[PDB]
Amino acid sequence: QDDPPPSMLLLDYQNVPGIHKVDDVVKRLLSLEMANQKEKLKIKKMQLMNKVLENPEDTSSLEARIVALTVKIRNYEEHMQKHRKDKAHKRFLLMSIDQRKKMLKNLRETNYAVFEKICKELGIEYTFPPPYHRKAHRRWVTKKALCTQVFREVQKLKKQKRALRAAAVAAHKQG
C-alpha cells in the first residue's frame, strides 16, 4: 500500500519552473489538498512505475500494464471496503484480478526474469490454476476428511508394528 504525501504539487504542475518562489497560497491551490481522488491516482501510478519498472516511457509493455492494473485493483479494494453492498464495482474488482492474473501468466511464459521481479515487488502471489474446478459440497469434504484421517491411522498401525513386533523378534536374538 502507498500513501502520497498531502502537500505535493499534482502531476501536471511539477516540471514547470518557478514554483518554489510562489507564495503558499497558490501552492495550496495546486497541492493534493484541493485535488480529488483522480489526481491522487496519477501520483500513485507515477511513483509506482518509477520504483519497479525499468523503462517508464514504454506503455505498451506487459509489465507497465500490470502496474497500471494494480493501481486500479488497489483503488477498487479501498472502494469496496467502504461500500460493501455495491455489486457493479465488485464485478469490476473480480474481472480486474482475472485480467492481471491472465497477463501475469503471459509474462511468465515469455520473460521469466522480469516476471520474478514484478511478482516480488508488488507482493502478488501467483498460484497455478488448479485442474478440475469442482464445487466442494458437504458430502465430498466430509468423506475426504475421513480418508485422510484413516490414512494417518494406518501409518501409526504399521509404524508401531515396525517398532514393537521387530523388537519382539529381536528380543529372542538379543536374549
Partner: protein
C-alpha cells in the same frame, strides 16, 4: 551392446505438468491422431513420468525424453535428456540469443 527397451516410444517431446514428487517430473506428451470419420488430425494427450536427477524441471517447460533401458517402477519408464525450452528463458537455437516471444532480448547484430 544390448541396451534396448520394450516400449514403443524411444524419444518423445512433451510439456512439463508438475514437479510435485521427488526427483521426478510429470510431463504431457502430445501426438496427432487421425479421426477415421472426419479424416482430420486432433491432439491426443498422454502423461509420462521422467526421472530428473538434478531437479531442473520448472512447470511450463518443453522437455525431450529418452527411453529408460530398465524401468525403475511400474510408471517411471523414461529419463529426462535435455531442457529444450526453459520457461521464460528461451534462447533461439538459430542465432543463440535470448528472446522473449517475438522480440529479441539482445540484438544479434551487435557483437560489441
Amino acid at each position: 551392446s544390448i541396451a534396448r527397451s520394450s516400449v514403443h516410444a524411444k524419444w518423445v517431446v512433451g510439456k512439463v505438468i508438475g514437479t510435485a514428487m521427488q526427483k521426478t517430473a510429470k510431463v504431457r506428451v502430445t501426438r496427432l491422431v487421425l479421426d477415421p470419420y472426419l479424416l482430420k488430425y486432433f491432439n491426443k494427450r498422454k502423461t509420462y513420468f521422467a526421472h530428473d536427477a538434478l531437479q531442473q524441471c520448472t512447470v511450463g517447460d518443453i522437455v525431450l525424453l529418452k527411453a529408460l533401458p530398465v524401468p525403475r517402477t511400474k510408471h517411471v519408464k523414461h529419463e529426462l535428456a535435455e531442457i529444450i525450452f526453459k520457461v521464460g528463458q528461451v534462447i533461439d537455437p538459430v542465432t543463440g540469443k535470448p528472446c522473449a516471444g517475438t522480440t529479441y532480448l539482445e540484438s544479434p547484430i551487435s557483437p560489441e
